Amino acid sequence: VEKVFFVTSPIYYVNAAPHIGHVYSTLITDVIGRYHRVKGERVFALTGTDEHGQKVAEAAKQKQVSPYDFTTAVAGEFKKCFEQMDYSIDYFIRTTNEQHKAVVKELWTKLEQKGDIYLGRYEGWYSISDESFLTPQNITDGVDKDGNPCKVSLESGHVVTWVSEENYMFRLSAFRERLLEWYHANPGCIVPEFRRREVIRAVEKGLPDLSVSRARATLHNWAIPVPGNPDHCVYVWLDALTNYLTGSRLRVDESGKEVSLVDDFNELERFPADVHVIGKDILKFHAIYWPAFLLSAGLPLPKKIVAHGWWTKDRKKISKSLGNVFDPVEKAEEFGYDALKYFLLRESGFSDDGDYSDKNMIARLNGELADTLGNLVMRCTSAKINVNGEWPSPAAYTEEDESLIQLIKDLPGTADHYYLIPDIQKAIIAVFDVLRAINAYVTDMAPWKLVKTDPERLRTVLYITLEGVRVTTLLLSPILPRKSVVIFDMLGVPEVHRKGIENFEFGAVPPGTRLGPAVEGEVLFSKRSTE
Ligand code: MET
Numbered sequence: 001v002e003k004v005f006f007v008t009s010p011i012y013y014v015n016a017a018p019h020i021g022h023v024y025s026t027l028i029t030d031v032i033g034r035y036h037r038v039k040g041e042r043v044f045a046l047t048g049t050d051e052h053g054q055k056v057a058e059a060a061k062q063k064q065v066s067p068y069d070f071t072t073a074v075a076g077e078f079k080k081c082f083e084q085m086d087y088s089i090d091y092f093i094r095t096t097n098e099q100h101k102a103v104v105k106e107l108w109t110k111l112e113q114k115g116d117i118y119l120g121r122y123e124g125w126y127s128i129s130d131e132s133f134l135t136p137q138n139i140t141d142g143v144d145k146d147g148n149p150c151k152v153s154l155e156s157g158h159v160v161t162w163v164s165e166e167n168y169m170f171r172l173s174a175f176r177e178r179l180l181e182w183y184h185a186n187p188g189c190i191v192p193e194f195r196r197r198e199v200i201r202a203v204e205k206g207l208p209d210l211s212v213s214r215a216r217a218t219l220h221n222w223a224i225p226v227p228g229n230p231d232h233c234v235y236v237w238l239d240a241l242t243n244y245l246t247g248s249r250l251r252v253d254e255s256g257k258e259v260s261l262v263d264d265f266n267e268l269e270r271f272p273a274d275v276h277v278i279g280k281d282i283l284k285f286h287a288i289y290w291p292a293f294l295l296s297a298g299l300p301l302p303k304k305i306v307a308h309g310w311w312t313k314d315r316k317k318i319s320k321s322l323g324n325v326f327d328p329v330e331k332a333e334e335f336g337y338d339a340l341k342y343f344l345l346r347e348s349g350f351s352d353d354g355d356y357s358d359k360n361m362i363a364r365l366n367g368e369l370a371d372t373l374g375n376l377v378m379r380c381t382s383a384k385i386n387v388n389g390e391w392p393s394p395a396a397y398t399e400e401d402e403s404l405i406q407l408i409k410d411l412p413g414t415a416d417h418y419y420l421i422p423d424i425q426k427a428i429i430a431v432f433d434v435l436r437a438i439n440a441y442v443t444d445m446a447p448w449k450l451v452k453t454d455p456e457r458l459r460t461v462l463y464i465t466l467e468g469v470r471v472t473t474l475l476l477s478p479i480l481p482r483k484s485v486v487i488f489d490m491l492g493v494p495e496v497h498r499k500g501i502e503n504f505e506f507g508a509v510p511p512g513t514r515l516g517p518a519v520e521g522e523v524l525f526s527k528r529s530t531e
Contacts (some may be wrong), residue, residue, distance in 0.1 A: 003269045006274050007274060014051050015059035016071070016076035017074065021311065023085055026449070027087070028306070028308065029089070030087040045093075047092055048078075048087050048093035049074070049078055049093075050095055050241075053131055054214075054236075058428065060218070060340050065228075067222045072251060075299065081329070084405075095240060099250065100242065100243060102132035105188075105423075106225045106227065111297055112227075114298075117168055117175070118168070119168055122167045124163060127150065127159075132153070132155075138153065142157065165214065168212050171296075172288075175296070178292075179295075183199065191305070191422065192306070192392065195280065195283060197284065210233045210235075216230075216254075241285060244276070249262045249268060261441075272303065274304065279307065279310065286302075287305055338481065338483045342479055343365070362529075370526070373435055373524070376442065376465070377490060380397050380491075390492075392459035393459060397464075406442050406474075407469065408438075411430065411434045414430050415431055418430060427475070428479060435468075437525070438469070470497075492516045494513070
């Protein structure tokens with residue numbers, strides 16, 4: 001029941017430089033982790049890089065450098081990218097890590113001791129780019145790097161090749177019923193629901209046994225050896241999925257450096273993951289293979305898998321080679337880091353393929369962040385309206401006052417359910433519905449007129465507004481981590497009241513609390529042009 005809340009992103013292939021997809025996945029992971037830290041929970045948030053395999057090894061060869069130098073460099077690009085995005089991830093794991101390799105061999109050996117690994121053959125299609133085994137139903141005709149006729153994945157469009165190899169096989173066929181029993185006993189374990197239904201449909205049809213090794217030549221000897229068989233390398237996906245178990249067993253110092261691998265996951269109280277964040281492209285690996293490996297090894301299953309969609313820009317596919325780039329840092333430098341995160345999390349739900357455009361980014365920045373949130377923060381901290389620069393003591397509440405108070409009191413329960421699904425978009429919308437109501441209340445009450453006309457009434461109006469802004473800001477702090485600090489500083493909210501479920505309560509900050517110092521010229525979110 002009480003354990004460290006454990007949330008993960010995928011670990012990303014290091015065949016190419018990091019891009020928006022990786023940033024988005026890790027963002028979602030970060031937001032979920034931050035919300036749980038805001039509730040006062042212990043959190044461990046994990047991300048990293050998937051560095052073995054034919055895909056990564058062949059990408060190294062193309063650049064004409066050693067896999068060790070290639071992976072170290074690209075991993076460094078991912079780390080730097082994520083530092084720049086200003087996340088709060090607790091550890092960055094690399095599959096080349098020696099302690100991860102130990103955990104993989106340990107798991108392999110468990111699957112083997114269990115009787116679930118035998119020496120067999122795979123003869124069939126393989127997508128090197130997705131490191132994915134495919135049936136003939138999942139391939140079709142296409143053209144290759146030369147424009148010659150070939151076969152491609154229906155899923156990804158990447159070139160497929162026919163593999164015929166003696167491989168170690170995991171008895172995935174034997175886990176059909178246990179997987180179905182898991183899905184049904186936990187009908188919230190895969191999100192969104194239609195992706196859950198997809199997984200169930202696939203497993204219902206039956207599962208073939210899964211190749212978990214490859215001949216070493218095929219992988220250019222860039223992989224983890226099979227314990228007891230140095231001619232075979234461990235399937236990159238079994239290696240990769242194991243990162244979640246490894247990460248749950250690493251003690252990390254202040255620097256973010258791994259200092260020690262514990263023998264048993266219970267010691268650190270992280271495993272199993274509470275939320276595995278993934279893209280829709282890798283659902284089968286996480287919802288079918290992974291729980292099967294865990295069932296086999298006698299390990300506990302993840303509580304939830306959330307699978308999101310794929311971004312476009314200007315209604316077209318993102319690619320530098322096609323002439324349509326989407327650089328997060330460039331966009332964050334122009335519009336703001338928190339604002340860019342807000343947009344990515346607000347514009348689209350997990351069931352959708354989001355679309356970025358500068359038009360729409362500016363519409364949300366101006367309309368929601370500046371006009372709704374920012375305006376409201378300026379109004380209730382203004383020396384023109386809040387003449388004493390403090391949280392006033394309210395007088396008697398009217399029915400209209402109380403209808404707004406009710407929305408503010410209900411908001412935390414509602415945002416919370418949404419964050420836990422998780423459905424971050426709906427959490428944001430719920431908060432901003434309350435911000436829109438506060439603004440409309442402020443417009444109705446015209447506190448600027450009240451200063452001269454009814455100072456007693458202004459106390460009430462101003463207090464409710466401040467408290468609404470505080471509560472909405474608190475719930476938005478996972479989304480706007482830097483701007484929420486600025487807001488709290490402007491409101492004079494003491495540190496202790498900026499986290500903890502105690503402070504989801506209306507009334508946490510007392511009358512008399514002093515506003516923070518006003519800086520000359522500043523605005524929270526500055527609007528931008530609509531050319
Ligand atoms: C264990 S998650 C592995 C994800 C994979 N490396 C990818 O980029 O799709």
